[PDB]
Subunit: 348 residues, 2 copies
């Protein structure tokens, strides 16, 4: 159990609603089957495409001068293009960007709490729009006539680790073993592979007939308490934000806040032995061998620039002050000999 | 109404005590409404380390005999000469403890106070601080244990009267009758409630805070014994020191945290406590206030007292202050303050933005009037 987890590689920052928040995974398969190795090159998803294939988009809401009306796609698109820069366009049509959706790999479906039940199933070139919870707004893609992206993989080198002919799993480019037990089969951009139970995908063939992925000392009690608190108050705090950080190595989300807009990014978390290997310099938070940059004093996961341009990590300080005060709560015994007035005893 | 902390202007030597020497501070303030015009002058006060009392170090001699036949040891009343000679070996030499062997087991340290009138020794090893003292004739004292005697760490001659120091100050008088002064530390001490005392043939007043001074302009006023304005904060802060002392004596144990409560919260004379290796110890202190933690911790491991970085002894300073593993001075009051800040900024929430149409619970209007989110465009 490490003292902290730091992402080895930060993915892109995509904005989210508080409803997208979820508690960490915390899996420790730990082999126990394989004591053999070999250098092989596996294929995985790039950070940014691991959790979901994000389709950027936007919402077009129709206004008449006020009253409402359901607009048409063509005019709405015309609005977007004349709104990414200063342009004459200013019955009026309002857009909001971005309205990100999560593309389903089964059927080109799009899941978003802006759709009724994450309803939009697909968008061939016969609809060009997509219904919304609002009867007078439509959702459309950031790019017109887009298609599924397929430059989403990366070649990486790891170790196979099989027991018999059967593959127990492997060791990723980060050095962490991952187990194939409990994984399902998934085909992405035609390539056949497996979705592991941590959420990662890898291109492999198993001689074990597996299922197919369906379309849908614990601290999790503390996590869900902190989280349900957020949904009950619609407000987030940098301590409750600290329970969302995965506590053990492996794939997870990293959260942050820009312009009071909650955001998440894919991350491979690695163990930390000393705080020093994370913060060598003063204002340096070392992510992947570099002083990670910030915006106006915030890094991800509640890590923020303190009141002195000092990298202030929450768990670091909490553990520190805990240790200091704990040093101050140590008891001792003074050594009086005949002070009380009790009697005639020998006393060693 | 209290300064954030209080640090000695200069410490006295350290004296070994037990938990029963522990007393709560006397956070006493003094106004003396008048006394506006101060006359620059010089006064004589007690040297730091003698203000409360004049300690005299000593040791306890217990005599026991062992009968090996299977041991059946018992006591005997020892002799002063052999106890002294064995004590002198306890420092450098080698002491050792049907056949029988007699043995003098020595206990150090045992400290007693001295009344300068009788030249008498007061302590709780005696019957009510009994010993008239030591002479050339009498070389020992009688303890509550019939087979145990007390003898000083020093030979019999101990003429003690080099206890004074001449300091500068300002005698604020008002017009007619001197009513107060300010010491070298720059703190107002008032004569309201002082009582006389003669020490080494020098008459002088002992004030309420405990300081003795060489001033006779009290006019005629009552002696000290042989031994209206109190804000709620003083009392409601005194009670927790009483709860902490009660906790200490009930538990027979001490900790740096519980030790920090006995600190004097306002400037003036007071006691400073600490513990080194299971040995509880105390020292005289002229406390002065602190405004910001920077002025008593300027460097990474510097505890500024008396114009210099104070030296620890195995990482323990005083008043619960110890040295952190990062070689950082850490003060109980300062660390608790820092915990309040650290959490009160962790305990700080914000309401992040919500895509108006991404909230499934947003009920849209009946009819066709506009919503509010589009007003912001």
């Amino acid at each position: 159990f490490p003292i902290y987890t730091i992402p080895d590689e930060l993915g892109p920052w995509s904005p989210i609603d508080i409803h997208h928040l979820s508690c960490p995974n915390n899996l420790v398969v730990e082999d126990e089957g394989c004591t053999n190795l070999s250098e092989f090159s596996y294929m995985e998803l790039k950070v940014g495409y691991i959790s979901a294939i994000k389709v950027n988009g936007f919402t077009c809401t129709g206004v008449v001068t006020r009253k409402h009306f359901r607009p048409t796609p063509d005019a709405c698109r015309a609005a977007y293009n004349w709104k990414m820069a200063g342009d004459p366009r200013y019955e009026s049509l309002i857009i909001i960007s971005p309205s990100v959706t999560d593309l389903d790999p089964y059927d080109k479906s799009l899941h978003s709490r802006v759709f009724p039940g994450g309803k939009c199933s697909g968008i061939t070139v016969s609809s060009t729009y997509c219904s919304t919870n609002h009867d007078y707004t439509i959702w459309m893609p950031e790019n017109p006539r887009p298609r599924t992206p397929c430059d989403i993989f990366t070649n990486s080198r790891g170790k196979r680790a099989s027991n018999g002919n059967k593959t127990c799993g492997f060791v990723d480019e980060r050095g962490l073993y991952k187990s194939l037990k409990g994984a399902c089969r998934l085909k992405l951009c035609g390539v056949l592979g497996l979705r592991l139970m941590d959420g990662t995908w890898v291109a492999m063939q198993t001689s074990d007939e597996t299922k197919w992925c369906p379309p849908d000392v614990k601290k999790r009690e503390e996590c869900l308490d902190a989280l349900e608190s957020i949904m009950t108050t619609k407000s987030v705090s940098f301590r409750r934000l600290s329970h969302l950080r995965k506590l053990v190595p492996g794939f997870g989300k990293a959260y942050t806040i820009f312009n009071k807009t909650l955001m998440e990014a894919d991350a491979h978390y690695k163990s930390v032995r000393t705080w020093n290997e994370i913060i060598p310099s003063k204002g340096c938070l070392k992510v992947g061998g570099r002083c990670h940059p910030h915006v106006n004093g915030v890094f991800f996961n509640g890590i923020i620039l303190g009141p002195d341009d000092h990298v202030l990590i929450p768990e670091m300080q909490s553990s520190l002050l805990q240790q200091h005060m704990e040093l101050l709560k140590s008891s001792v015994i003074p050594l009086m000999h005949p002070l009380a007035d009790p009697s005639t005893v020998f006393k060693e």
